[PDB]
Write an enzyme that holds these catalytic residues in place. Sequence first.
Site, PDB file in Angstrom:
ATOM      1  CG  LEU A   1     -19.507 -10.619   1.275  1.00 37.11           C
ATOM      2  CD1 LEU A   1     -19.960  -9.167   1.050  1.00 37.11           C
ATOM      3  CD2 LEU A   1     -19.429 -11.388  -0.037  1.00 37.11           C
TER       4      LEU A   1
ATOM      5  CB  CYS B   1      15.169 -21.983   1.280  1.00 34.83           C
ATOM      6  SG  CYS B   1      16.964 -21.957   1.296  1.00 34.83           S
TER       7      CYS B   1
ATOM      8  CB  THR C   1     -11.548 -13.938   5.181  1.00 29.57           C
ATOM      9  OG1 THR C   1     -11.551 -14.103   6.608  1.00 29.57           O
ATOM     10  CG2 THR C   1     -12.167 -15.169   4.497  1.00 29.57           C
TER      11      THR C   1
ATOM     12  N   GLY D   1       0.791  -1.214   0.000  1.00 28.99           N
ATOM     13  CA  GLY D   1       0.000   0.000   0.000  1.00 28.99           C
ATOM     14  C   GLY D   1       0.826   1.266   0.000  1.00 28.99           C
TER      15      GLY D   1
ATOM     16  CE1 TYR E   1       0.073 -17.738   6.918  1.00 28.75           C
ATOM     17  CE2 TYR E   1      -0.873 -19.821   6.183  1.00 28.75           C
ATOM     18  CZ  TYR E   1       0.199 -18.928   6.236  1.00 28.75           C
ATOM     19  OH  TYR E   1       1.400 -19.218   5.604  1.00 28.75           O
TER      20      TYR E   1
END
Length: 547
Positions: free
Chosen positions: A266, A402, A256, A45, A314
């Site tokens: 949503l 890695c 999400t 952003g 997550y």
Amino acid sequence: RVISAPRGTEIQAKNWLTEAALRMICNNLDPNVAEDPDSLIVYGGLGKAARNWECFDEIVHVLKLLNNDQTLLIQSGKPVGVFTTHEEAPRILIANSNLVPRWATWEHFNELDKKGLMMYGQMTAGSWIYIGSQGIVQGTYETFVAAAKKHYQGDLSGRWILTAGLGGMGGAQPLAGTMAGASVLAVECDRQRIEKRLQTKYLDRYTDNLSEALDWINESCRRKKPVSVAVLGNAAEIFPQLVKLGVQPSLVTDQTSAHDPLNGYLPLGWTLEQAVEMRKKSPEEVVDAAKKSMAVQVHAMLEFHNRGIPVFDYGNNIRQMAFEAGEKNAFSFEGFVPAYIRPLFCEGIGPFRWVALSGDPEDIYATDERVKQLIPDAPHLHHWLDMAREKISFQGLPARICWVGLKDRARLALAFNEMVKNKQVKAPIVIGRDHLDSGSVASPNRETEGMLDGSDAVSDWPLLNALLNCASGATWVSIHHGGGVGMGFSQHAGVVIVADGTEKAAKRLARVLHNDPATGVMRHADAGYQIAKQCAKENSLWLPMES
Ligand SMILES: NC(=O)c1ccc[n+]([C@@H]2O[C@H](COP(=O)([O-])OP(=O)(O)OC[C@H]3O[C@@H](n4cnc5c(N)ncnc54)[C@H](O)[C@@H]3O)[C@@H](O)[C@H]2O)c1
């Protein structure tokens, strides 16, 4: 203007160490790398490579002029001073976006930005080590492989992952999951995002028919041939439906935008257009409906968890949102950081990133093969390297990531330095990492959430990481504020060191690539983790307060 890293073996700077800095800041603005380089925005952003174009031009000017005993200071993307140090010190010292704590807000940042006084460094934007989307893809692969190692003896064949969200970070899940050997069913409510991931080969198939999606997944699991399938719909509808059907994903997670109930998630039963309109008319109703929907989704995730399936957050705050909306058992499954990443951090295993300054992809392929020689018994590492070659396209300067531990980072770096010297790569190698490493981040809502000792918010550690990498001979060192989680919520440090083939650089590499992960083993041993205490002893660390 169009910016890209100079290539080949000719240099414009006085030596390869400052040539490396020149190439890396330019690479951060490569149109194949940066999200909005016309505004100097690299990613995230507002993560910028320099404060503005006047600052960028002067950074380039200074980097070409710096002698091997001079050090440029970067202050929120502005080249504010050059001072004499010495050859064994960094050539650039970077401090970006740091604000006195009571002023560490987006409101004050923006006030300062409008006055020409601020730049957001994110993590690797302001510290010149961003290499495109490989970071997110590799990191998601690492998480899925960690889960595979913990629950399934490292083997995801014939298994599938249930998740949601195919956004800026979530869109890496299909490729990461299939690279890790699993099929992937990802729920996503925005058809345009799905179609974009299809076009760019990040996703194999999609459908709006859940039964059809499951039949594709089961066919692939049967054939042991991983496929990724997006289901167009709402995770708060699809996850409870999958619970009711009794299906058996082997991992369940979610990406999400649950952290943003107003503008991200949503609500159940809403169209995208209804959400757009309701945000303008009734923001509180949007937030309430989104959080109630997250509670429905987390309730389904908990049912899979109750059935013995590994379920993990997550890093999107969905458990807390669901908890606030009435799902009082939301925290019965773990976040991915305490479950999978923190144990790796306890051994100093973390992002190890390197960049071929030559521009030649054969340089990275040569180093890929060398890593496989140096760490021969590591199938998930070898598979990643093999699969990245055919699945991961280079962006700008060819580069590789890695995860490598305290025991091995210096071994790899010295081998790379030897390859530069003996011409098995065509030009020097930049070695670094993102700022999310074992010893280099304080982030109480993410990477240091729930430390055993409750030291989540202690930020001494990333500051010591930067000071020690400066003392150890890194080529540039950075201290940043607010990456990822925003103003007020994190402090973190970066490090880059150039392997130019010289014996002098070899001495620096041996220190930096040991000390940098060792600070993470130290930090986690201090917090009480026995995995870290054991690792410290195995590596003969001098930790004075450790028994
Ligand atoms: N290291 C980490 O902590 C880490 C890693 C990956 C993701 N995350 C977190 O995961 C979240 C997602 O990140 P992102 O950058 O992809 O965000 P994003 O806003 O780009 O994507 C979110 C996606 O979710 C979809 N979505 C929203 N509501 C949905 C619903 N009800 N059902 C299905 N899909 C829905 C949106 O259409 C969008 O594509 C963030 O909170 C991020 O911080 C964290």
